[PDB]
Amino acid sequence: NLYFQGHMDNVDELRKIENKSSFVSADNMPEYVKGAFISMQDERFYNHHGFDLKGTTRALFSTISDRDVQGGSTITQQVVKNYFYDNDRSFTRKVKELFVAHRVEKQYNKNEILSFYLNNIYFGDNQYTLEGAANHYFGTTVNKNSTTMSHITVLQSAILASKVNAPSVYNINNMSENFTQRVSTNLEKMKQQNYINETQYQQAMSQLN
């Protein structure tokens, strides 16, 4: 995927992701597909400006519970980190990613960011786009208009949204109990955030079981 990585001399370098053959715009995806990723990675994605300082602070200080605590990276931060060439993880690189995230949010709307996200992160088996992965893993499609191809299910969406946390380890064919827990949590959060309903939720929990 080196061609679709760089140093970010200008944020318009991300536009080159649009020329991938399996590129699919966020606009062209079903909501529950997008919400699988949003719910699992950065629930207030549409609301914040790349950092989610307010919501992070509430989830921390408002309840004793960890119910609202999320992972350490908003989707916008993840897009920066994945556009930058692969490198060792450190505080100094994280901070640069935060700085650049602000520049990405300044230039692009949430759907463009989300499109750069889903079409340039690693899903396993050499797939750096969400359509390549769905096709490869399930032979399904995340284009909501297709009349040609089976549409990605709720479960399969959750599976891919959880998978990108450890794409080389989490194995779709032989799912570990931990990968299974991750996906279960993803589904529940898709339900709580109203991307799916009880029926879908139960159908997906059944399929997973």
Added chain:
Amino acid sequence: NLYFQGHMDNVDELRKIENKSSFVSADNMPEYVKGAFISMQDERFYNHHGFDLKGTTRALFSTISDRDVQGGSTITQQVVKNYFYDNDRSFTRKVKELFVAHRVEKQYNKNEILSFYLNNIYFGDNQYTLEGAANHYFGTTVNKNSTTMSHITVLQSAILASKVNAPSVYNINNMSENFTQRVSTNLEKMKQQNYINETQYQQAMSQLN
């Protein structure tokens, strides 16, 4: 171990650890067993209020030596992290664990905390309690009253206290040089902190060699 994990709506969720079949109270353990864990994880456990700010600061700024520097998590922090469902490690989750640790210290005494610790952390091979591990690995017991079962040795205590830092990697049967170094350091610290004496120390160093 999912049943004995949760979101901590209330700190009294930890009391459910008490119903594990192999539950053994800290009160019912030999001191050198407890000190194996305390010495290796959080020496001033009994003295601090969950954070060890004072002692951490001295170990840092008082001597050039690293002799008094410890790991990044007090036993109380470890109990929170292990009660929370398995999740990716991040700054935002660490901070929530610190917040909740303060609530745990407010409610419980040190022996209750230590009991929640030793009976709900992972020791390897599907063992989430210190008695299950001792029984499984050594066929020994950490109940100081048993007249029925061989009592866990000093070495075996150090081995398990070091093991929980990387329970899936550190292998009791075929010990790596690093695991071996960890255990050696544990024994020395058990000696320096007066949980064991020279005799015990040397007997354990002999057995390890």
Added chain:
Amino acid sequence: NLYFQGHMDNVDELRKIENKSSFVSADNMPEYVKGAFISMQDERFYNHHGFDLKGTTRALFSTISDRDVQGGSTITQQVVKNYFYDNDRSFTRKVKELFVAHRVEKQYNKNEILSFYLNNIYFGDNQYTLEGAANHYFGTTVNKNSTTMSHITVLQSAILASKVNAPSVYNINNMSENFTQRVSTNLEKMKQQNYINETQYQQAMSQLN
């Protein structure tokens, strides 16, 4: 390598690295050998006092680009971390390493520090010195005076400088695409920092390809 590790009661403990059989002083190495490590780990090594606060801050805030951002550890910090016994990585240990780095910079000149670096970090296959590794991996030597032995090439220097980031994983014989990317970047930085020229750069890129 335990003998050449310790608690740093005094910074003069590092002088014992000088008695290693394959010890080679930085003074006795070709510049491009040293620059392979400097360029890849800490470009302003000679200029800063162990922390590189100024340059780190510029690389962060001056350009949107990540072009000048480096890894999270100056060579002096790396020498401390590697002199200290192997231990779990944490914020509290990192901070102690920073404190001691300042004491190392106070006592020693840059060539002594660089000599402690290259002669006590892990290169793979049981090699804790740069000469042991060059001899073992390539049968070459980093002593610039040798009339006896083939001299380490530009490529081989970059390979070893990148290798110490993950010495047990990066494999010289069967190089992963990532290890390959690391080395490529190292060479380019050796060129940009004027340790090598275009000819050398291209010869090394050819050999690597």
